[PDB]
Amino acid sequence: PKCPECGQHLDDPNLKYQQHPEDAVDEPQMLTSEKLSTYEDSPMHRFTSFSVYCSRGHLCPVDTGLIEKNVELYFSGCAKAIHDENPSMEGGINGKNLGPINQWWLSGFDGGEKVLIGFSTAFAEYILMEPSKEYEPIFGLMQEKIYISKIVVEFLQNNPDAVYEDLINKIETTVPPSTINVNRFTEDSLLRHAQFVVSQVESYDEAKDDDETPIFLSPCMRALIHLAGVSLGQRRATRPTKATTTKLVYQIFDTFFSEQIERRRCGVCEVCQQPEACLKRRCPNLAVKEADDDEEADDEMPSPKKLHQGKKKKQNKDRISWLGQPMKIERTYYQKVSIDEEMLEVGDCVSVIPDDSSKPLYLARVTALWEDKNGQMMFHAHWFCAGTDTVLGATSDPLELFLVGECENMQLSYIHSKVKVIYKAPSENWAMEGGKTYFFQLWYNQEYARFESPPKTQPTEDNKHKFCLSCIRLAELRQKEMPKVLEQIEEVDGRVYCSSITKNGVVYRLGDSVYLPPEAFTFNIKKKDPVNETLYPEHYRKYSLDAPEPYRIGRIKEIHCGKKKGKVNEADIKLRLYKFYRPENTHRSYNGSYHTDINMLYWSDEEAVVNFSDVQGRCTVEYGEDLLESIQDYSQGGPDRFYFLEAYNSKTKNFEDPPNHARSKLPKLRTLDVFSGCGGLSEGFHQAGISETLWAIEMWDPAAQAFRLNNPGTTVFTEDCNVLLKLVMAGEVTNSLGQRLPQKGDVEMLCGGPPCQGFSGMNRFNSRTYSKFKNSLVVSFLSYCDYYRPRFFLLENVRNFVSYRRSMVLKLTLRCLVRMGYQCTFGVLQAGQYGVAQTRRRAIILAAAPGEKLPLFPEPLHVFAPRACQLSVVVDDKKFVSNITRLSSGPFRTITVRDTMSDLPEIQNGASNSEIPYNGEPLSWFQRQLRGSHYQPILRDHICKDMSPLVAARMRHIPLFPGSDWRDLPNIQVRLGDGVIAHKLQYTFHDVKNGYSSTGALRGVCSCAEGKACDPESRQFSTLIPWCLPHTGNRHNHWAGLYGRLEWDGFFSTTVTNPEPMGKQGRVLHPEQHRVVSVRECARSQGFPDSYRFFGNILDRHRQVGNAVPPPLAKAIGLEIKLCLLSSARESASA
Ligand SMILES: C[S@@+](CC[C@H](N)C(=O)[O-])C[C@H]1O[C@@H](n2cnc3c(N)ncnc32)[C@H](O)[C@@H]1O
Ligand SMILES: [Zn+2]
Ligand SMILES: [Zn+2]
Ligand SMILES: [Zn+2]
Ligand SMILES: [Zn+2]
DSSP: OBOTTTOOBTTOTTOOBOOOOTTOEEHHHHTTOTTOOOOOSSOEEEEEEEEEEETTSBBOOSSSSTTTTTOOEEEEEEEEOTTOOOOSSSSSOEEEEEOOOSEEEEEOOBSBOOOEEEEEOSSOEEEEOSBOTTTHHHHHHHHHHHHHHHHHHHHHHHOTTOOHHHHHHHHHHOOOOTTSSOSOOOHHHHHHTHHHHHHHHHHHHHHSOOSSOOGGGSHHHHHHHHHTTOOOOOOOOOOOOOOOOOHHHHHHHHHHHHTTOOOOOOSSSSSTTSOOOOOOOOOHHHHHHHHHHHHOOOOOOOOOOOSSOSOBOOOOOSOEEEEEEEEEEOOEEEEEEEEESBOOBTTOEEEEOBSSSSOOOEEEEEEEEEEETTOOEEEEEEEEEOSSSSTTGGGSOTTEEEEEEEEEEEEGGGOOEEEOEEEOOOOTTOTTOOOOOEEEEEEEETTTTEEEOOOOOOOOGGGSSSOOHHHHHHHHHHHHHSOEEEEEEEEOSSOEEEEEEEETTEEEETTOEEEEOTTSOOOOOOOOOOOOTTTOTTGGGGOOOOOOOOOEEEEEEEEOOEEOSSSEETTOOEEEEEEEEOGGGTTTGGGTTTTSOTTEEEEEEEEEEEETTTOOEEEEEEESSSOSSOHHHHHTTSTTEEEEEEEEETTTTEEEOOOTTSOOOOOOEEEEEETOTTSHHHHHHHHTTSEEEEEEEOSSHHHHHHHHHHOTTOEEEOSOHHHHHHHHHHTOSBOTTOOBOOOTTTOSEEEEOOOOSSSOOOSOOOHHHHHHHHTSHHHHHHHHHHHHOOSEEEEEEEGGGGTHHHHHHHHHHHHHHHHTTOEEEEEEEEGGGGTOSBOOEEEEEEEEOBTBOOOOOOOOOBOOOGGGOOOOEEETTEEEOOSOOOSSOOSBOOOOHHHHHTTSOOOOTTOOOSEEEOOSOOOSHHHHHHHOSSOOOEEEOOOOOOOOHHHHHHHHTSOSSTTOOGGGOOOOOEEOSSSOEEBOOOOOBOOTTTOOOTTSOOOBSSGGGTTSOOOTTSOOOSBSSOTHHHHHHTTTGGGTTTTOBOOTTSOBSSOOSSOOTTSSSOOOBOSSSSSBOOHHHHHHHTTOOTTOOOOSSHHHHHHHHHHSOOHHHHHHHHHHHHHHHHHHHHTTOOO
């Protein structure tokens, strides 16, 4: 038996009937009392000992949505005076069956604890005080709900941009008062109250209306919305940073504003059925999809076609005649000057009108003037590239031109008029400067988006008549690309035996070792039964390319080649090689790769023949015994350095000793690291031996402290970068704390990874979004670069920095750098490829001052999964790429979760001891490198979060097999150990898309499985299999990774900052232990030396680590900067 009015079961042991006080009088008579007397018209009163009930007398909730379901709810209690704060029945009248509740409402989400609950009846408004004794429990739940909603709203007011893991932490960390009858809130609570908490958050946005992003569109909010099946639109209750800039950087972003700066409704929701004073009827479902789609980018496009190819229109027929004496003969007669009505000579710039279509106007430099054998008057046009046409596009000066590698021969007829083109050469004192017609400053490589300093030059008397930089460039590159023979010995048949050969600038002699693709050669080569679906209801969801092999290494035995005509055929150069085996290439296979050095090989008496084309590169394979420094010293002393100690017999499968023929300063830049963090980037740079961070700016206390702990001789300014620059600029010498502020000339290198959050969107710019970016940390960072003028500059960000705002963020960043006079470029890199068991891409912007060399991007060292290696960037329908050629392969095997952490001693959930013995030697190569040569007793930071008794129970129950997650959890009752019992999941609905179990059991956890609306209180909580997972699984790929364990042969899905099992940071459970990953494990996943110090509480340390640039990637970049210094160091020393 149930209620026809409210639906409560009569058998329900929690049912309670309405009990009235003697003094009970109807509403109109109560709203007549003398006892009774803020901008409203109703009126308003206080109300105590309240009780809400159905027409039949059952006590009822108000949250449950019965008021909306047209059910008349009535209330009774003691009304009081608007100002009377006494929650005791002593000042008012007792009312009974007070008018059907029109609506209920809340107020109090800002500067106050004024969380007031109010009722609206057809007669007056009521501010509820204390409930009645019998109503207390029902109002109790309602209170728990409201309190969570407050915490969430307040947290989001001070922290938009907050991620799911921040929300969960804010909640779990907030101590509820005694008044709220709950110990502490968990993710279970939030999930349980996901519908209420979300709707109140939507309601806060309707009510407190600005122009700001609604709080329900928060990253954490949308994460909750997607995780817990929640219906949006359920309507309810009611009641400017200025970036420190240099004028040059101000103007750049100020002109873009004054120049280039100028509906799929759901139908179904309650906002979509709400007409119409009111302007906002904004669909919340559309709002989410839009916010979600703003987060994703469009990551296989053809090469961008060269400009000026291209048709041009001929001109004049008046008078064109040579002026003066010829410069030289060649079948061609070169001349310096030429009349075309007016004068024209070598070095003058001309304009050429194309075919009148998409007609900008072509501009070139007159490189040469001559008259061929056919009497045709000619000129060599070395083409310029406009302000637009470069990656910069619209962002550029309509007068700035760029030198490109585009030149062609043309008749003097095609010339329109001579144009004035000025070189905006850097000053005598350029580094100190920070604070009409055509001009050019830099050289543009289309393919790589490299803006660089011009060659300057030089024209010899031997080629003074021809001098084309664009021709010289193509020559050098044709010359370096061609396979040429250095020295030959004695030719045999058609084969000419050689002692040395060359390509790409690399010189290959005999005995030198070589890199080759895995296909280049070969070595001596070598169902499932039914599950108990009662126990595993979710397993059915389980259903429903990996890294290449590192390079083949071979030693050169014979450079034989072939021949065509009479002289040596360069098209055919061949090599006979002694094959080397990597330990994995042996009968050892996977067991080789483990404890073995990444760097070790095996000598083989095997032989192979490959073409010189296939050769990927040159490496150094030495024999272990004939070495003068330690294997470690030799190995960590230069690139492509391999080694062998034994030889492998593929036949006998044995390890014999090898045969006897198998046998045989840098300037540290003064760096300023803005947004320094705990110091990852500085560390890799320090590791490259190219820098010394003397200044670091870090706004967050824990990170700045962790930086100091690792960089003792560094002035760490625990400040906001904007305020720090303002001081220097104001003329200040030291900060408040008496710390010496760096002045112009002090900074040689300025590097930094500003956080996104501000800009952080994909859709087109607008007055609102532009203003935020106009004062972003990217803008503050560019000013630091402007003011300081470092020899080198690095900006680091999330890969998507390159896609944000229709690539406008990247274009304005590059624009700025160019204005300032800097050679600059961008590129994407994958951490994984640099020796870290983690899949993470970063956008990297490189800039170097004129005088210096613009560095190339590092070549990948480790082979990584192709899917993780999409390094290309589309800007304005053009696919940009970096100098990286190793697409594809690499010299070393992939770093795995095993290589990363297999040595660390066992810990449990909530492991709190920061200093513990290792109780074991390193096992992997990577472990050896991160642990050091010198023995250290203390293992620091093998500390992991204390997960709730529910989450802990879940982790214990996730199997150990690779790729096991939530779907593997058993549907069993678990004693949590606090009296609390993790319950079995109830499947009471038909999942129409998923079908029945093998047993014929239902797969439905909510009514929405059947296509009907969600039935609340059909919602389950504190279950081992989370209810929210089956609930939304179908529309979210079954929540694949959730409660999933990292794989030993796998890697980290991303940079983890707060390990949460149903979070947005990928597989976070340890491969074997019933816990989430420890701080130190994340530190290892990042490639931090074990000596690296961290500061603060567990989460501050987790944040520190995950925010960091992995030192291996930082070192890779740092080592490209090494070449640039060494190269510019020698090119300085001369006559
Ligand atoms: C993602 S981290 C960069 C990581 C760092 N490059 C590393 O390798 O460790 C961003 C850092 O910038 C700091 N930050 C944010 N706003 C800042 C500001 N206005 N001035 C200085 N630092 C700021 C943050 O507290 C955070 O440490
Ligand atoms: Zn009832
Ligand atoms: Zn809608
Ligand atoms: Zn040329
Ligand atoms: Zn549902």
